[PDB]
Nucleic acid binder design. Structure first.
Lengths: 79, 114, 100, 127, 151, 99
RNA sequence: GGCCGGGAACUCAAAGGAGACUGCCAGUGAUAAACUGGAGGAAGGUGGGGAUGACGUCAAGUCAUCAUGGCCCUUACGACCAGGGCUACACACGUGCUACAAUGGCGCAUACAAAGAGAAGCGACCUCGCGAGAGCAAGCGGACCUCAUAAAGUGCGUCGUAGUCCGGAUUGGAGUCUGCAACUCGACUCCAUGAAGUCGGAAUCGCUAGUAAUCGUGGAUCAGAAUGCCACGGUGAAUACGU
């Protein structure tokens, strides 16, 4: 969080993203890592984020850059 | 005296009077008066046109009134459209910064409904 | 406390003692100013591959005779109940009931 | 020749030396009016010399530490009373009748378990 | 209490003048253990009152008190299943205490600016037989008069 | 030079015994000493709940007292220092020697 | 400037002792036990405050601190792992903190404490940043060094009864630190915003003196996270006719 430390990401997620980009086409990328930041090189992909029970698909656009992956997958049910 | 599209009181001291503008607090008021060269305990009715114009020029350097209001509205609309946790809270009408809801929360809810 | 929880604590202490120096070096790299601006990134990516149970903040103090996770005192290494039993029997030097 | 007295109140301790002549008071290297800005404190410090008519016949050198304004003033009064007793030895009756010979043994009461203060209880409800 | 004898506490006299009445008045005016504030207020009030009357502060104070002291009051009794008002005499210490309490209570409700000004105005009105304190004395005497059958 | 001895204990009779022993052994060996100086005692306090389940009042309070003493030797000799080093005292006192 | 030579008087530190017993005097009372008052004394009649809980009562609380009779499960009611929950939110109740203001709010500058903690710890002086903080580095296992600057108070100015120069919930932007990691769900700093609320219906609680009320300071748990709990001192009242 301190600026002198840089953004935080999970190593396996970073490698998966790099492979998908370089190899071109992709199907949704499954992940349990809600504590990772959204990097500019993700725009246009589909990440399926865990919420406790299911994986929720998030289609990454350019207004999401800088937020954590967990803000787009609510955990509690209410009506 | 008209400054930023509004009238400001003429019987107060300058440092208090200048806070009637939307976007100017105590610290910014002190900075404005220091940069303009006017004391803080001088009533607005004991000044001159040149001094008031100096104040206008200094106040022009910040974002105030309509511009600031538009900025804030766009800030909130962005989140609401994005659909993150904060946006969902904003459009449900509940606290945003993680406060309790089992009791209290009445500033964001309103008076009770039986 | 169950018999598995005490085993968990023993394993945690072992790993934290094993990996002490590597973590200190990597944290010194990350913290130190005027670094290469790339060694920092690499150290950040390397610190998170070590086992999780090597961070001393995953440990919880427990009573040494029962394993209780609440009511701990640091001078004695015991919880309140065992402290009282030992004190009344006379097994803690210098301790006694106080008034003022 | 000097005459000495020790005085104590709530948490304060006071050392007093008295000599004859030309009434002047020094406390902690300052004058009475500079040290004590309170008329009550000044009156308390001056009471016994007014009682025994020696206001303008004795010089006083005083030191004090601990406590607060009222405690320091009271400790000084106790010390001056004892020093005057040492000086004369026949003013004891009058000082005792005035009430300056007693040590006031009132301290602060301790805090107790289950109470908010020494004697204040939490609020109680039947239902 | 049931089986107790309560002695008297010693009260120091005023530092400027030498009365214990004035010390008790300061004590009744103070709030939260702040005695210096109360002393300042009372001294300012007496100073402003002395000029309006050309007499001494103590004399003005006594003149104000003598028009507020009460003489008789009413207590409540219930032995036949009903509430009765029984008139009784007031003893001197209680006379003074009640007068002081009523004066301060009246002053606090005024609408002047500072407490010293409020107290000065209330004391002057009392010296001239006007104000809420004097109205209170009148009400008490009226109630005591309307029940002399139960003495 | 000068030697300083610091003594600590949980029991003041023990501490006084040891201090007198040190003073006597220093005086018999041809030296001068500056008598023991009492130093402020330490009081550590603890407070615990005495029921295995909910009763938030009903506590116990305990204390440990630590007593402390200091002795100084001004003009030593080789025999005196050796004698001090070759001595043993009670089994509840802590002795620290500074040269 | 207790700075230096010195001194052992005083404040203080902590070990041995002295002192308070209706002991002395008068009156009352059964030729009593006791009671009301007086002298001297730092203190007087249990001097003030703690610890100390009879035979028993409520099949009172605790098989989730621990131990234990009898039942019950053993490729599962026993292990291991990552993510979520214990923090939900139309509503009802208990315990608290901050206020609704001139006995006050804000600016400048100036007195007086007690009791505690500290080696994977307490972190001075100096430099940089408006600030939370960062860099370099003495001292201390401590009546020596550090945390550590008491606050209410006092003096001089301004605000002049207004939802205000009263109050500080919410919300937008920009940051710091602990920690592999602060989305759900941390504490803190700067700029901006500026809600309810003008003393509270029927009920109802605490306190007999250094007490109530008001003002600050420390510790345990603890990487971080108190308006709670346990301790410490400053200022300092009103009233008790009576059952």
């Amino acid at each position: 969080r301190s600026l002198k430390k840089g953004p935080f990401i999970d190593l396996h997620l970073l490698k998966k993203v790099e492979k998908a980009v370089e190899s071109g086409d992709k199907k949704p990328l499954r992940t349990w890592s809600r504590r990772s930041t959204i990097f500019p090189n993700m725009i246009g992909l589909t990440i399926a984020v865990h919420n406790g029970r299911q994986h929720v698909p998030v289609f990454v656009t350019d207004e999401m850059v800088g937020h954590k992956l967990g803000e787009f997958a609510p955990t509690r049910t209410y009506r | 005296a008209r400054i930023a599209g509004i009238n400001i009181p003429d019987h107060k001291h300058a440092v208090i009077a200048l806070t009637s503008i939307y976007g100017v607090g105590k610290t910014r008021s002190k900075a404005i008066l220091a940069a303009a060269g006017i004391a803080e305990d001088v009533k607005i009715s004991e000044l001159s046109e040149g001094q008031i114009d100096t104040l206008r020029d200094e106040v022009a350097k910040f974002v105030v009134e309509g511009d600031l209001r538009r900025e804030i509205s766009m800030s909130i609309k962005r989140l609401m459209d994005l659909g993150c946790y904060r946006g969902l809270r904003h459009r449900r009408g509940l606290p945003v910064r993680g406060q309790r809801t089992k009791t209290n929360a009445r500033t964001r809810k309103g008076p009770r409904k039986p | 406390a169950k018999q598995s929880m005490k085993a968990r604590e023993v394993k945690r202490v072992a790993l934290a003692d094993k990996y002490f120096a590597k973590r200190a070096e990597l944290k010194a790299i990350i913290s130190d100013v005027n670094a290469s601006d790339e060694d920092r990134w690499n150290a950040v990516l390397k610190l998170q591959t070590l086992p999780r149970d090597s961070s001393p903040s995953r440990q919880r103090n427990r009573c040494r005779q029962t394993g209780r996770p609440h009511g701990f005192l640091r001078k004695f290494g015991l919880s309140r109940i065992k402290v009282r039993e030992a004190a009344m029997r006379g097994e803690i030097p210098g301790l006694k009931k106080a008034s003022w | 020749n000097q005459y000495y007295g020790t005085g104590r109140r709530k948490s304060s301790a006071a050392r007093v030396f008295i000599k004859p002549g030309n009434g002047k008071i020094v406390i902690n290297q300052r004058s009475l009016e500079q040290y004590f800005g309170r008329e009550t404190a000044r009156m308390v410090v001056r009471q016994p010399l007014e009682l025994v008519d020696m206001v303008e016949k004795l010089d006083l050198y005083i030191t004090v530490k601990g406590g607060g304004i009222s405690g320091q003033a009271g400790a000084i009064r106790h010390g001056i009373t004892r020093a005057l007793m040492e000086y004369d030895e026949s003013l004891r009756s009058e000082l005792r009748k005035a009430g300056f010979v007693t040590r006031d043994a009132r301290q602060v009461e301790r805090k107790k378990v289950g109470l908010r203060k020494a004697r204040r209880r939490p609020q109680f409800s039947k239902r | 209490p049931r089986r107790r004898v309560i002695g008297q506490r010693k009260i120091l006299p005023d530092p400027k003048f030498g009365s214990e009445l004035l010390a008790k008045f300061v004590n009744i005016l103070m709030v939260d253990g702040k005695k210096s504030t109360a002393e300042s207020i009372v001294y300012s009030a007496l100073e402003t009152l002395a000029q309006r009357s050309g007499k001494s502060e103590l004399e003005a104070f006594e003149v104000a008190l003598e028009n507020v002291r009460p003489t008789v009051e009413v207590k409540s009794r219930r032995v036949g299943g009903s509430t009765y008002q029984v008139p009784v005499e007031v003893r001197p210490v209680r006379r003074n205490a009640l007068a002081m309490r009523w004066i301060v209570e009246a002053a606090r409700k005024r609408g002047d600016k500072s407490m010293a000004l409020r107290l000065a105005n209330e004391l002057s009105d009392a010296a001239e037989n006007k104000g809420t304190a004097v109205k209170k004395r009148e009400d008490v005497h009226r109630m005591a008069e309307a029940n002399k059958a139960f003495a | 030079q000068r030697i300083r001895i610091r003594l600590k204990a949980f029991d003041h009779r023990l501490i006084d015994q040891a201090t007198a022993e040190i003073v006597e052994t220093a005086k018999r060996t041809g030296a001068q000493v500056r008598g023991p100086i009492p130093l402020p005692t330490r009081k550590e306090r603890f407070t615990v709940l005495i029921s295995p389940h909910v009763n938030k009042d009903a506590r116990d309070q305990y204390e440990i007292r630590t007593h402390l003493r200091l002795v100084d030797i001004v003009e030593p000799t080789e025999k005196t220092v050796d004698a001090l080093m070759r001595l043993d005292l009670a089994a509840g006192v802590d002795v620290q020697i500074s040269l």
